[PDB]
RNA sequence: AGCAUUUGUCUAAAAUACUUCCAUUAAUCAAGAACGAAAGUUAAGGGAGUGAAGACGAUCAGAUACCGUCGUAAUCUUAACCAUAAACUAUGCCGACUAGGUGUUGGAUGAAGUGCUUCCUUCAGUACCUUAUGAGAAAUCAAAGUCUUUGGGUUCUGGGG
RNA sequence: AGUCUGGUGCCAGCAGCCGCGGUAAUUCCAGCUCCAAUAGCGUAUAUUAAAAUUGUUGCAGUUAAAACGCUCGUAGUUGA
């Protein structure tokens, strides 16, 4: 709506000098502005609008001279259901505040997962194109693709996370302590992140580069 | 769908959300040593920069491109 | 004591790729190592390699394309039959889409798919992707 | 390294070419004769090779003659029944046992004496397998003086 | 492709699924066999058909 | 060419010293037996021109920031910045300044030019989180980590810093539309430096 | 291997080490030792 | 395990050097064997000092303890034995590959300070400091790295209290 | 799937497990409502998955359990 970005990259997005989040991922630019994501996934106009879910509220306590203080850490999962997941974490003294801060974090956190085929090009992209394994704390979680009709093989937490990411046919497995949920979520998120990190034959081809938004819109960027 | 890109120096793929890797824009000269219109751009991964081999790799790449003559 | 050269050599190549070397010096040299490099060139992983002659043992200097995610050796060199291959690749490879599992079979050293198409089992040497 | 804790690599470098030097164009017979004289004088094959390099100035026999010195001695039928290497090892072990007989409190001498004899057994077993020591042969410390006599 | 068990079993399964009425007109390939869903199997039931034809006014009535 | 090279040669720029970094030895010419390192300087000149080539190719020079912690280098960076239209940053780098979006010094720069990356280390670290290539005037004891462009020089004297920035400024002004390359730039030689 | 032999002829070692080391588990000890049928009064019945 | 006076003797040892010899002799090893601190046992010396036991004076609520003074066994050597210790780099051994700098001990290579001294290059030892887009539960670790992207070889070991 | 109603008051008792009960009980004893599966559903013992907690695939051994005090060595496994 009428919201004000104070970053120049934000202001480019606000005007519409940048078409997609994909370009910002291309030039690997830091995102400290939620409005970019809100503009691109435009709730009533979007093809695949971002869907939220508070996965875990946890008590944590400092302990002090005059007694205990309960703070609340909050983990939230957000996803388009098609290709972009986000995992957001905030600790605050008040639960609803924690949840809102986490949702803002989740939008900033927003990452593209690579979706392809298990094998043959006989339908649409539907799962990770290869193994990814992600570690956080004790827990190392491995996603490995399954053939079609083999949707969401894994634990409930994994099912939800893969659904937000838009992954269908895959096996999940795990090593270490699953029970620690924040690490478990993060380990999944780490694996999803690795998907555009692994090299594939299609990426043997030479790469040549579009120029920076900071050079493409330099005059408008000075002006506004 | 997202298209990732690779480091010029190492061939290595650069992740989407990494936030440290860079694109180095090098201006071509005009005959009297003024800025020409054209610019050659090269992609440097964060790992090489953290190592501090970026200057050496860049020098090797510039020599291959004929943008430096002294090689090393 | 040194035992099989090939595994340490492939780990060295993996380390070299992780480091980002572009070229690397293998101090071991053998017929099987040469065949493996020729095979890696066949599958577009390795470029050119130069074998340097010393009577005691040559050396090999390999130009790397940086495309490797990992190259490794399976020891012991297990026997594997044609229908067993599917289990082995499912275990080893990052995907069924790409990556290459290498055998030695009575039609020569070759990857699993080629061997499978041919039709003979054999011993497993290694893999790369 | 077999028993030591080192791994020192000081050794013979060896040139790339197996061809004769420019300096010496000597006939095979001259090279055999020179070795034969050293052998006859009672020098042992390592000593002969060392002497051939230093005293006679010649690059080593396998390069200038195309055949190993031990093999040349064997071909003329004059090669020693006990190995040079085995002879020195047994001699060192005998020396240690003589010393140990005098001194019973030298633990390191005892430790080395079992170690060296174990090395002799391994070397002996290899020589038996290559058929250079008899099938019935065995090392004994009693007969060791007779062995190197 | 081109395996005797595979082409025999696949042709037989597809024929049978067509006869049961699970598969559509051009649904004759293995990704449609994977494509099947629980409502479609339920739809083959006689009570569902009796409701559908309008013989009864509800599935439970059917 | 050679007159500029000679001015660098008479200047103190090429005097390397003991404790010299591994990476930098391809720019060192020889170890002196007196415990000092001679720097080739010829590669430095061509490399400085490469740095000028990257700087010129930037659409807005006023988004290109110069930095020096050093008291004596502070005037030299400010004068260098004044001519080329850059912002100079002197003394403390407030640690969140590029990264943080509500801080007073909130800045989205295109390129960063560093006086000694040993001294100016916080800016160098921040620059890597902000995806900036980084030019750095590097010395014997200086890191080469993070930075893409390394310029060899002794950076512990005011005249050296000033001469290299002054020469860089002439080269950039020549690459720019400001003045023809045919005639020497006569402005403020021996005069960027501290009082 | 590491802490295990790879060896082609080492199936012998793998069997023997597995056979010896299996006994350390409590459930296994209870299941395969005779004490079960002895000290327990019910001895393979739910009910008595 | 352990090893510090002088000189000699009997012995072993590693690295360096080698256009010297052998020609696969190897690696790790159930069984079995060797060496194995301290204390203890048994026999001779010796019994200085220290000193389990023990004795007194205190101390103290009590003190059979700390503290003070005395003091047998023991400490030491020779001759047997004994066979364990936080017998700890708390990290099995062999083997490759990996990262900088500051050092340091034993050799070899070059040069300049005044043959020698220093420094440079290199080997085999050996620590520290920083760095690990390496690792790990973190402490930390250049090995505890090259390990769900899991297989260099091997012995031994553990399976909740 | 209930901050539902009375009675009991570390008692009676329940509850694989964590726990509830010592006076304004959401865990007991009833009652009410709700929920799950259903002509079947509890309970126990046996056994598999779970368990990459016996580990070929596929464990762990600096500090959590675990490198034989140390070395040689036959069987053994491995051997450019």
Swiss-Prot record, chain F:
One Gene Ontology molecular-function label: structural constituent of ribosome
GO biological process terms, semicolon-separated: cytoplasmic translation; ribosomal small subunit assembly; translation
Keyword Cytoplasm: yes
GO cellular component, one term: cytosolic small ribosomal subunit
Cellular localisation: Cytoplasm
Keyword terms of this UniProt record: Cytoplasm, Ribonucleoprotein, Ribosomal protein
Source superkingdom: Eukaryota
Coiled-coil residue spans: none
Role played: Component of the ribosome, a large ribonucleoprotein complex responsible for the synthesis of proteins in the cell. The small ribosomal subunit (SSU) binds messenger RNAs (mRNAs) and translates the encoded message by selecting cognate aminoacyl-transfer RNA (tRNA) molecules. The large subunit (LSU) contains the ribosomal catalytic site termed the peptidyl transferase center (PTC), which catalyzes the formation of peptide bonds, thereby polymerizing the amino acids delivered by tRNAs into a polypeptide chain.
Family of this protein: Belongs to the universal ribosomal protein uS2 family.
Subunit structure as annotated in this protein's UniProt entry: Component of the small ribosomal subunit. Mature ribosomes consist of a small (40S) and a large (60S) subunit. The 40S subunit contains about 32 different proteins and 1 molecule of RNA (18S). The 60S subunit contains about 42 different proteins and 3 molecules of RNA (28S, 5.8S and 5S).
Protein name listed in UniProt: Small ribosomal subunit protein uS2
Parent-record interval covered: 10 to 204 of 263
């Amino acid at each position: 709506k009428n919201w004000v970005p104070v970053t120049k990259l934000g202001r480019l997005v606000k005007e519409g000098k940048i078409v997609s989040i994909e370009e910002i991922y291309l030039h690997s630019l830091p995102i400290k502005e939620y409005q970019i994501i809100d503009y691109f996934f435009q709730p009533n106009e979007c093809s695949h609008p971002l869907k939220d879910d508070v996965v875990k509220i946890m008590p944590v306590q400092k302990q002090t001279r005059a007694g205990q203080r309960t703070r609340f850490k909050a983990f939230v999962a957000i996803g388009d259901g098609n290709g972009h997941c986000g995992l957001g974490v905030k600790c605050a003294k008040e639960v609803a505040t924690a949840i809102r801060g986490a949702i803002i974090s989740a939008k900033l956190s927003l990452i593209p997962v690579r979706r392809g085929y298990w094998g043959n090009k006989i339908g649409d992209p539907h799962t990770v194109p290869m193994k990814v394994s992600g570690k956080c704390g004790s827990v190392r979680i491995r996603l490995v693709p399954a053939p079609r009709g083999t949707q969401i093989v894994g634990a409930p937490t994994t099912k939800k996370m893969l659904n937000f990411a838009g992954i269908k046919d895959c096996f999940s497995s795990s090593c270490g302590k699953t029970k620690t949920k924040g690490n478990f979520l993060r380990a999944i998120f780490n694996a999803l992140s690795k998907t555009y990190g692994y090299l594939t034959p299609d990426l043997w081809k030479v790469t040549n580069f579009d120029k920076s938004p900071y050079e493409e819109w330099s005059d408008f960027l000075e002006t506004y | 769908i997202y298209i990732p890109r690779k480091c010029s120096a190492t061939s290595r793929l650069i992740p989407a959300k990494e936030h440290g890797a860079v694109q180095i824009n090098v201006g071509m000269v005009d005959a009297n040593g003024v800025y020409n219109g054209k610019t050659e751009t090269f992609a440097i991964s964060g790992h090489v920069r953290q190592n501090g081999e970026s200057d050496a790799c860049l020098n090797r790449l510039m020599y291959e491109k004929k943008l430096l003559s002294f090689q090393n | 004591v040194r035992m099989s050269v090939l595994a340490d050599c492939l780990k060295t190549i993996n380390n070299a790729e992780k480091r980002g070397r572009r070229q690397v010096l293998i101090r071991p040299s053998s017929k099987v190592v040469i065949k493996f490099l020729q095979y890696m060139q066949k599958k577009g992983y390795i470029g050119s390699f130069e074998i340097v002659d010393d009577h005691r043992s040559g050396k090999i200097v390999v130009n790397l394309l940086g495309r490797i995610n990992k190259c490794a050796v399976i020891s012991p060199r297990y026997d594997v039959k044609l229908d067993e291959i599917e289990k082995i690749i499912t275990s080893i490879l990052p995907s069924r889409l790409f990556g290459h599992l290498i055998l030695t079979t009575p039609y020569g050293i070759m990857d699993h798919e080629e061997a499978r198409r041919k039709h003979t089992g054999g011993k497993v040497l290694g893999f790369f992707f | 390294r077999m028993y030591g804790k080192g791994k020192g690599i000081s050794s013979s470098t060896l040139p790339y070419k197996r061809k004769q030097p420019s300096w010496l164009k000597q006939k095979p017979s001259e090279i055999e004769d020179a070795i034969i004289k050293l052998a006859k004088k009672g020098q042992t094959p390592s000593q002969i090779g060392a002497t051939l390099r230093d005293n006679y100035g010649i690059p080593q026999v396998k390069s200038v003659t195309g055949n190993k010195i031990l093999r040349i001695l064997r071909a003329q039928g004059i090669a020693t029944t006990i190995p040079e290497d085995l002879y020195f090892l047994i001699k060192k072990a005998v020396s240690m046992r003589k010393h140990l007989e005098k001194n019973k409190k030298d633990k390191d001498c005892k430790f080395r004496l079992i170690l060296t004899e174990s090395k002799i057994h391994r070397i002996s077993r290899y020589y038996k397998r290559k058929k250079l020591l008899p099938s019935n042969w065995k090392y004994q410390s009693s007969t060791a003086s007779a062995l190197i006599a | 492709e081109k395996s005797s068990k595979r082409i025999f079993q696949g042709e037989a399964l597809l024929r049978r699924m067509v006869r049961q009425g699970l598969l559509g007109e051009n649904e004759e390939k293995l990704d449609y066999v994977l494509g099947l869903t629980l409502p479609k199997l339920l739809e083959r039931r006689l009570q569902t058909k009796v409701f559908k034809l309008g013989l009864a006014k509800s599935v439970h009535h059917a | 060419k050679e007159e500029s090279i000679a001015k660098m040669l008479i200047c103190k720029v090429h005097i390397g010293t003991k404790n010299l970094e591994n990476k930098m030895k391809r720019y060192v010419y020889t170890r002196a037996k007196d415990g000092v390192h001679i720097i080739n300087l010829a590669k430095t000149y061509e490399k400085l021109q490469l740095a000028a080539r990257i700087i010129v190719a930037i659409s807005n020079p006023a988004d290109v920031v110069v930095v020096s912690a050093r008291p004596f280098g502070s005037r030299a960076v400010l004068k260098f910045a004044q001519y080329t239209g850059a912002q100079a940053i002197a003394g403390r780098w407030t640690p969140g300044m590029l990264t943080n979006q509500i801080i007073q010094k909130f800045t989205e720069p295109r390129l960063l030019i560093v006086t000694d990356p040993r001294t100016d280390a916080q800016s160098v670290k921040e620059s890597a989180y902000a995806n900036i290539p980084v030019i750095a005037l590097c010395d014997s004891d200086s890191p080469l980590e993070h930075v893409d462009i390394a310029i060899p020089c002794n950076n512990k004297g005011k005249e050296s810093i000033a001469l290299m920035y002054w020469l860089l400024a002439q080269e950039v002004l020549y690459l720019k539309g400001v003045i023809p390359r045919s005639e020497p730039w006569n402005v403020m030689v021996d005069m960027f430096l501290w009082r | 291997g590491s802490g295990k032999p790879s060896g082609l002829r080492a199936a012998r070692k793998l069997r023997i080490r597995r056979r010896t080391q299996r006994w350390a588990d409590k459930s296994y000890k209870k299941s395969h030792l005779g004490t079960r049928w002895k000290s327990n009064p019910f001895r393979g019945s739910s009910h008595a």
